[PDB]
Short mmCIF file of C-alpha atoms in Angstrom, two decimals:
data_model
loop_
_atom_site.label_atom_id
_atom_site.label_comp_id
_atom_site.label_asym_id
_atom_site.label_seq_id
_atom_site.Cartn_x
_atom_site.Cartn_y
_atom_site.Cartn_z
CA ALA A 1 19.02 11.07 4.12
CA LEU A 2 19.62 10.38 7.83
CA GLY A 3 21.70 7.31 7.01
CA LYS A 4 24.88 8.73 8.52
CA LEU A 5 23.17 9.05 11.91
CA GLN A 6 20.97 5.95 11.82
CA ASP A 7 23.92 3.71 11.00
CA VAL A 8 25.90 4.81 14.07
CA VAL A 9 22.99 3.91 16.35
CA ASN A 10 22.53 0.62 14.49
CA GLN A 11 26.20 -0.25 14.97
CA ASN A 12 26.06 0.51 18.69
CA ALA A 13 22.94 -1.62 19.16
CA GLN A 14 24.54 -4.36 17.07
CA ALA A 15 27.60 -4.38 19.33
CA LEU A 16 25.42 -4.55 22.44
CA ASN A 17 23.37 -7.39 20.94
CA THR A 18 26.44 -9.39 19.95
CA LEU A 19 27.96 -8.95 23.40
CA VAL A 20 24.72 -10.09 25.04
CA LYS A 21 24.37 -13.13 22.77
CA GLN A 22 27.93 -14.12 23.64
CA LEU A 23 26.58 -15.04 27.08
CA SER A 24 24.64 -17.96 25.56
CA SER A 25 27.74 -19.54 24.00
CA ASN A 26 28.97 -22.76 25.59
CA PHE A 27 32.65 -21.89 25.07
CA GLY A 28 33.23 -25.60 25.65
CA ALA A 29 31.53 -25.72 29.04
CA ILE A 30 28.70 -28.16 29.70
CA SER A 31 26.16 -25.34 30.10
CA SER A 32 25.98 -21.67 29.17
CA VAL A 33 24.34 -20.70 32.50
CA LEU A 34 26.54 -20.41 35.57
CA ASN A 35 23.69 -21.29 37.92
CA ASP A 36 23.30 -24.70 36.27
CA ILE A 37 26.98 -25.59 36.63
CA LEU A 38 27.01 -24.38 40.23
CA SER A 39 23.87 -26.26 41.24
CA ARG A 40 24.83 -29.48 39.42
CA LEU A 41 28.58 -29.89 39.93
CA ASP A 42 30.89 -29.73 42.92
CA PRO A 43 33.28 -26.75 43.07
CA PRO A 44 36.29 -28.95 42.22
CA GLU A 45 34.45 -29.99 39.06
CA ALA A 46 32.54 -26.74 38.54
CA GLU A 47 35.70 -24.64 38.33
CA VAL A 48 36.91 -26.64 35.32
CA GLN A 49 33.97 -25.39 33.24
CA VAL B 1 22.31 -57.31 31.00
CA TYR B 2 21.08 -57.97 27.46
CA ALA B 3 17.56 -57.54 28.88
CA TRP B 4 18.27 -54.66 31.26
CA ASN B 5 15.07 -53.70 33.07
CA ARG B 6 14.07 -50.03 32.88
CA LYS B 7 11.64 -48.40 35.29
CA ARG B 8 10.21 -44.94 34.63
CA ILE B 9 9.80 -42.77 37.73
CA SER B 10 7.65 -39.64 37.87
CA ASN B 11 5.12 -37.89 40.12
CA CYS B 12 6.92 -38.51 43.40
CA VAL B 13 9.36 -36.92 45.86
CA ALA B 14 12.41 -38.99 46.77
CA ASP B 15 15.54 -38.16 48.72
CA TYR B 16 18.96 -38.94 47.27
CA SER B 17 21.34 -38.54 50.23
CA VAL B 18 20.28 -41.92 51.64
CA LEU B 19 21.93 -43.95 48.88
CA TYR B 20 25.15 -41.97 49.14
CA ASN B 21 25.14 -42.40 52.92
CA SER B 22 24.75 -46.16 52.51
CA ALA B 23 28.23 -47.52 51.76
CA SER B 24 26.98 -50.93 50.61
CA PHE B 25 27.59 -49.86 46.99
CA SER B 26 31.13 -50.64 45.84
CA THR B 27 30.93 -48.13 42.97
CA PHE B 28 28.87 -44.92 43.19
CA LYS B 29 29.61 -42.36 40.47
CA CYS B 30 27.73 -39.57 38.72
CA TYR B 31 28.06 -37.85 35.35
CA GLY B 32 26.73 -34.36 34.68
CA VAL B 33 25.52 -33.87 38.27
CA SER B 34 26.76 -34.30 41.83
CA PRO B 35 25.06 -36.72 44.24
CA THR B 36 25.22 -34.21 47.10
CA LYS B 37 23.63 -31.41 45.08
CA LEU B 38 21.20 -33.97 43.65
CA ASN B 39 18.92 -33.70 46.69
CA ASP B 40 17.47 -30.26 45.89
CA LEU B 41 17.14 -30.59 42.12
CA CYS B 42 13.86 -31.47 40.42
CA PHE B 43 13.59 -33.45 37.19
CA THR B 44 10.91 -34.24 34.62
CA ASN B 45 11.53 -38.00 34.61
CA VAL B 46 13.93 -40.57 36.03
CA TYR B 47 14.92 -43.86 34.41
CA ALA B 48 16.27 -46.63 36.64
CA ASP B 49 17.94 -49.31 34.50
CA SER B 50 18.86 -52.41 36.50
CA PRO C 1 30.67 -68.08 44.72
CA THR C 2 34.23 -69.31 44.11
CA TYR C 3 34.82 -67.05 41.10
CA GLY C 4 37.10 -64.05 41.38
CA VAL C 5 35.86 -60.58 42.22
CA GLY C 6 36.19 -59.52 38.59
CA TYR C 7 33.96 -62.48 37.69
CA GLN C 8 31.65 -62.36 40.72
CA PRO C 9 28.13 -61.10 39.97
CA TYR C 10 27.44 -57.39 40.50
CA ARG C 11 24.09 -55.63 40.46
CA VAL C 12 24.27 -52.35 38.53
CA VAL C 13 21.61 -49.63 38.55
CA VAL C 14 21.92 -46.61 36.26
CA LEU C 15 19.78 -43.56 37.04
CA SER C 16 19.30 -41.24 34.06
CA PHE C 17 17.55 -37.90 34.54
CA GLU C 18 15.39 -36.31 31.85
CA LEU C 19 14.86 -32.57 32.34
CA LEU C 20 12.91 -31.31 29.34
CA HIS C 21 10.78 -28.16 29.05
CA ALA C 22 7.94 -29.85 30.96
CA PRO C 23 6.71 -29.59 34.56
CA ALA C 24 9.24 -31.38 36.74
CA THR C 25 7.58 -34.40 38.34
CA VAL C 26 10.45 -35.77 40.48
CA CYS C 27 11.84 -33.48 43.18
CA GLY C 28 13.68 -33.76 46.49
CA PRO C 29 12.75 -33.33 50.16
CA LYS C 30 12.33 -29.56 49.92
CA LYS C 31 9.41 -27.69 51.43
CA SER C 32 7.49 -25.01 49.54
CA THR C 33 7.49 -21.44 50.86
CA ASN C 34 4.74 -18.87 50.49
CA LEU C 35 5.22 -16.76 47.38
CA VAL C 36 6.71 -13.28 47.82
CA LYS C 37 6.41 -10.63 45.10
CA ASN C 38 7.73 -7.13 44.42
CA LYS C 39 10.90 -7.85 46.42
CA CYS C 40 14.48 -8.86 45.66
CA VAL C 41 14.23 -12.52 46.67
CA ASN C 42 16.24 -15.66 45.95
CA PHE C 43 13.88 -17.94 44.03
CA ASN C 44 14.09 -21.64 43.17
CA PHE C 45 11.33 -22.87 40.83
CA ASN C 46 11.73 -26.66 40.59
CA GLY C 47 15.48 -26.33 40.21
CA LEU C 48 15.56 -23.10 38.17
CA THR C 49 17.50 -21.25 40.84
#
């Protein structure tokens, strides 16, 4: 019966989850964590990724 | 070269700025990491292939 | 000895790093500080800055 309300909450949480998971995507960079690229590459090379 | 000799290195602390400081190496390049930042960066194993 | 530079012998050493999900066993000349808890600190656990 409470579908109309549960679904809204589900959608919001889904959006949040998708947005958070987008942080793990490489997007073509060598690593998905900024700290790794910073600690491993020089700024002239780090900025490319 | 066909029999390149590989040495595994583990359980030890070694600096890395010394090699970069020494200019006796005609070519000194790195891929995926910077030699300067390499000093303070641990690793599980190192392979030296000569 | 009389061969050209492109033909002269050259010693080549390739260092390859393996950083798996195992305790890091090769580190650099970095001292270890006493652990501090319950505070906003800048931590570096065997490279996991």
